[PDB]
RNA sequence: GUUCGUGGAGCCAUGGGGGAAUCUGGGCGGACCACCGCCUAAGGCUAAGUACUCCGGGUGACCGAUAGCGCACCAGUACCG
RNA sequence: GCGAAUGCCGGCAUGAGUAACGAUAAAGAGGGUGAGAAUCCCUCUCGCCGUAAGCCCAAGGGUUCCUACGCAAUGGUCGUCAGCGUAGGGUUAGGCGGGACCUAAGGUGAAGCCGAAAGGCGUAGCCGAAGGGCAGCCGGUUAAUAUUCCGGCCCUUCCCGCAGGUGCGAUGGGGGGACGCUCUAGGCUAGGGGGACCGGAGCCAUGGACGAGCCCGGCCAGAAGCGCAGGGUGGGAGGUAGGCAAAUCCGCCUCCCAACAAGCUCUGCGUGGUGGGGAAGCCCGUACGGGUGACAACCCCCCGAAGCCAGGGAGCCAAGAAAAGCCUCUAAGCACAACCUGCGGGAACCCGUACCGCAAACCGACACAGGUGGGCGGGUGCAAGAGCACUCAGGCGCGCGGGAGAACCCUCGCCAAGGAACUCUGCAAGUUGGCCCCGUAACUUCGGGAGAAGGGGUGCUCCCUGGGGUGAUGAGCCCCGGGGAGCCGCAGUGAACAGGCUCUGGCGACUGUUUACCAAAAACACAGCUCUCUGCGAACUCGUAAGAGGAGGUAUAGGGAGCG
């Protein structure tokens, strides 16, 4: 389940580390699809956008082939379940009956040897890639597309599944891990059943470090700051928020629909968030 | 245009002390190169050159008076001559 | 402790030298400033 | 912009919206209407007279090495950054 | 028209022959040069560093390096000396470090995008390094150059002619190059310690000693080949849509076989043709140093690395660059060409090269007690060790000294009796201190507190004995011990380096960070918890905009806020 720690030493009686299991499918990494060396920046030309991003370690980013119309009809084989520290899951590397290398994150439950197959003629199993007019009603589903034809984008994060909670005509709706019942179109594509890697809730970072691991940089609270950066900061001994609450640029914190109104993107959902 | 060559044999005693070898050193202009310099001496000396040497030799800042300046930069050659012939004119 | 000046030839070289001026809009700035006033040495010199 | 700062606010260019006519067609004479006068816009060029002195020379109720340009001298140099 | 503006500029005063003369590592003496010597040169003693106050590089500085002649000025004094002045020399590279090779962050930038203009983004490509690749080791020579000059010896790139073989050939494809941290098994090397063995000029002091007596050195480099230790790699046949396919190459599936192996390739070490070095001591010694003592010896044993085999093995999460050389397959092209291996002959270019480089030459206005990256960095004892104490090779006595030995300042040592009574406070100082052996409470998140607190021993000599490693099974050599018998001193980690402790509360969970240069904290941060927003051309941020961060991410993610 979850790898802990007697309590040797302080800041280690509360850390937990994921349980590396399906990780011994293959040990080393495969250097044939993921040449591309991540270029960490936590800024733009010049200036920290992102507050208190960087640091860490380096990490080389695995090139994904997502768009799952590359082959269509061809089928695969899943041969190894291996680590991504750029996503949130461990990813399956399989290979071919063509003989392609490829690298798709593994959904929840996958073996070594089975067939899976990125076409519209595939039977209801784990793995394959189908569009959302041929996935039935009620079946959890992943890594589904907005607008067709521009990879896959929604519901790619560790254990989340998005669900089909009906049809309406040629969109069909189904449930977002929020929570948010959205319309999409019949022939992007989908791969069925959960995402896995479901204890990643479970882990607790334990120290200051595995922050600074993982390369989060210490993010300072605004209570403490100076009235110049930011509205909270200043007063003498911890004054009361200044009536507002507030970002370090004027807008509202808490309780601010932020959404541009008149989004194009809009008109497609019937819902907006489960409370 | 011959784009000539070497200004004058520098003298010195280590000069002087290769001028019982085949070294025959001498300041040459500050822009050649190893190989024209073979073919400086080759054919103005009508010689055999085995294995000329180069370095460049930084001046010295100097002054005369209340007015500081600097002498020349310029470069020095040694020539390792074939052996049996030697030069017959450079007798310092 | 550190002192402020601590020299490196290739740092001056491309951060005071004469492209490191003329690649800018003010360092023509500088380049028309300094031959206005006489200066001998337009661009900081990096002995080799 | 013209003296014009929205005042009765013309004229000269226009960022946007509507939008023609070719001498019985138009613009102007300071909200505007009629008469009476001036001129042809929505294409372009034009010397001469006017400003200034890196430089050349002549002059000065101009100065005479703490003056005069920062430098009468091997000065935008030595030196500082 | 000057006397004032804490006026300015230049000169000269007072302070005054006053403070200081720059780490409290230390100087003394005899000769020599010289007009002049505590300071320059030589010799004999003493002291200091010796994980450097020693040596080798990269930064940085730019002739400061050497010789000869001098003290106008400088050196916190003098100075005949000088890193000071004048003149003359000195830096030698196919193999060392860079370019003619490549690439990361980043910069420039064909196409393209945006912006009043200057301009700003930006694909391909280019630049960009203490990153990858690439062919050199030993010794001598000068006053100054050395992996460059020379002596030995081994390699690399390119071209030409010949011999043999081949379907040769890319800015194309493909594998490889290609990588984290910690612990590390085996062998070797660098480095080091002994020997009754080898060689050497000498000595028997002062009581004893002509002997396993004292002292010094017992090496380095080295091609082919041969041994030792490792690393890499399954060898063939067919099919295959893929390598933004052109493939016999690679990937996938079927394998008669081999399969912890072996074969074939790649390194390191030893031996290896041979070459070089060869002391301590003694004569000639102005300096420099030269002959030396040899026909020099150049043998054995042990300790042993962070270094090499290396891309070894195991464990862990935080998941650990790119491209080029090189290996292979092909497109256009060429197959009288082109490519590979040998045999002989040629060519190998531009810059750096001196000196200081943990300081007197770098940065600090200074010959400044400050700071400056990498490597070697010895020996003996303290359990160990880059700590401590001393000392090899190497340097240095810190560029003002000599008297007296007042108060007073700094540093250090000691003290009858009291033991914190002084003070805002055991502030400061002092004790405990290292190792081995018994023992260790309240309380708790069961780890911790804890080295709790408290104690006993530590020196030397002899005898017996358990072993381990190398060596051969032990003789020899290192390491871990145990018991008994004694001996001396007040004191036995006899010197130096080395915790004061406990109880009780406040605050902060803890490690950590900050107010460079008066505040290291009850301030910041932190894991975790809660709220809110954002479904993606996301929210939010920078930018007029393009665009970029977010992110080559997807509500188990990201942004903001609060408590911690
Ligand atoms: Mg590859
Ligand atoms: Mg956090
Ligand atoms: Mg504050
Ligand atoms: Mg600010
Ligand atoms: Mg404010
Ligand atoms: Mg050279
Ligand atoms: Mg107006
Ligand atoms: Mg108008
Ligand atoms: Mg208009
Ligand atoms: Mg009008
Ligand atoms: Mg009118
Ligand atoms: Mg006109
Ligand atoms: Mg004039
Ligand atoms: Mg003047
Ligand atoms: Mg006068
Ligand atoms: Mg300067
Ligand atoms: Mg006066
Ligand atoms: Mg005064
Ligand atoms: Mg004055
Ligand atoms: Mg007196
Ligand atoms: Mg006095
Ligand atoms: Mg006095
Ligand atoms: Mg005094
Ligand atoms: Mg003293
Ligand atoms: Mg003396
Ligand atoms: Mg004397
Ligand atoms: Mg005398
Ligand atoms: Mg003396
Ligand atoms: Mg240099
Ligand atoms: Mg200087
Ligand atoms: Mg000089
Ligand atoms: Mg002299
Ligand atoms: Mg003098
Ligand atoms: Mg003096
Ligand atoms: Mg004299
Ligand atoms: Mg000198
Ligand atoms: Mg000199
Ligand atoms: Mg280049
Ligand atoms: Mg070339
Ligand atoms: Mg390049
Ligand atoms: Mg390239
Ligand atoms: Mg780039
Ligand atoms: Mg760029
Ligand atoms: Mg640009
Ligand atoms: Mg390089
Ligand atoms: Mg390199
Ligand atoms: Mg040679
Ligand atoms: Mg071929
Ligand atoms: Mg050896
Ligand atoms: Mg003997
Ligand atoms: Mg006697
Ligand atoms: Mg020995
Ligand atoms: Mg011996
Ligand atoms: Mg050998
Ligand atoms: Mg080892
Ligand atoms: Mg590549
Ligand atoms: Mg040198
Ligand atoms: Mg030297
Ligand atoms: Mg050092
Ligand atoms: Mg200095
Ligand atoms: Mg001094
Ligand atoms: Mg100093
Ligand atoms: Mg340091
Ligand atoms: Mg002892
Ligand atoms: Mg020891
Ligand atoms: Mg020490
Ligand atoms: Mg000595
Ligand atoms: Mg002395
Ligand atoms: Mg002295
Ligand atoms: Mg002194
Ligand atoms: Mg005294
Ligand atoms: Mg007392
Ligand atoms: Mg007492
Ligand atoms: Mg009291
Ligand atoms: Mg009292
Ligand atoms: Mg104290
Ligand atoms: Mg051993
Ligand atoms: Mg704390
Ligand atoms: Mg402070
Ligand atoms: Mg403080
Ligand atoms: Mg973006
Ligand atoms: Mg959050
Ligand atoms: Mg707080």
Same mark, same amino acid.
């Given at each position: 389940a979850v790898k802990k720690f007697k309590p040797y030493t302080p800041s280690r009686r509360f850390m937990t580390v994921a349980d590396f299991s399906e990780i011994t499918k293959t040990e080393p990494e495969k250097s044939l699809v993921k040449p591309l060396k991540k270029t960490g920046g936590r800024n733009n030309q010049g200036r920290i956008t992102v507050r208190f991003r960087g640091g860490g370690h380096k990490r080389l980013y695995r090139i994904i082939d997502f768009k799952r119309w590359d082959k269509v009809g061809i089928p695969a084989k899943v041969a190894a379940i291996e680590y991504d520290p750029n996503r949130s899951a461990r990813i399956a590397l399989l290979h071919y009956v063509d003989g392609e290398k490829r690298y798709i994150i593994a959904p929840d439950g996958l073996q070594v040897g089975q067939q899976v197959v990125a076409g519209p003629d595939a039977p209801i199993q784990?793995?394959? #890639? @189908?569009? @959302?007019?041929?996935?039935?009603?009620?079946?959890?589903?992943? #890594?589904?597309? @907005?607008?067709?034809?521009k990879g896959a984008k929604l519901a790619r994060a560790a254990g989340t599944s998005a669900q089909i909670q009906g049809r309406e005509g040629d969109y069909v709706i189904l449930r977002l891990p929020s929570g948010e019942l959205r319309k999409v179109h019949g022939e992007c594509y989908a791969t069925v059943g959960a995402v896995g890697n479901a204890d990643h809730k479970n882990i607790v970072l334990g120290k200051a470090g595995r922050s600074r691991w993982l390369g989060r940089r210490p993010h300072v609270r605004g209570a403490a700051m100076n009235p110049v950066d930011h509205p909270h900061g200043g007063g003498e001994g911890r004054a009361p928020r200044g009536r507002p609450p507030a970002s370090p640029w004027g807008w509202q914190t808490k309780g601010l629909k932020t959404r541009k109104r008149r989004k194009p993107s809009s008109r497609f959902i019937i819902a907006r968030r489960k409370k | 245009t011959a784009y000539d060559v070497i200004l004058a044999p520098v003298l010195s005693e280590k000069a002087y002390a290769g001028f019982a070898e085949g070294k025959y050193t001498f300041w040459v202009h500050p822009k050649a190169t190893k190989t024209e310099i073979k073919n400086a001496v080759e054919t103005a000396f009508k010689v055999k050159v085995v294995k000329v040497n180069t370095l460049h030799v930084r001046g010295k800042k100097k002054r005369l008076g209340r007015y500081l300046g600097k002498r020349p930069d310029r470069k020095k050659a040694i020539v390792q001559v074939?052996?049996?012939?030697?030069?017959?004119?450079?007798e310092g | 402790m550190k002192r402020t000046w601590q020299p490196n030839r290739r740092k001056r070289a491309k951060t005071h030298g004469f492209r490191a001026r003329m690649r800018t809009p003010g360092g023509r700035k500088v380049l028309k400033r300094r031959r206005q006033k006489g200066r001998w040495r337009l661009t900081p010199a990096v002995r080799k």
């Open positions: 784990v793995g394959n #890639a @189908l569009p @959302l007019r041929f996935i039935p009603v009620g079946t959890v589903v992943h #890594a589904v597309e @907005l607008e067709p034809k | 074939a052996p049996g012939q030697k030069i017959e004119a450079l | -």
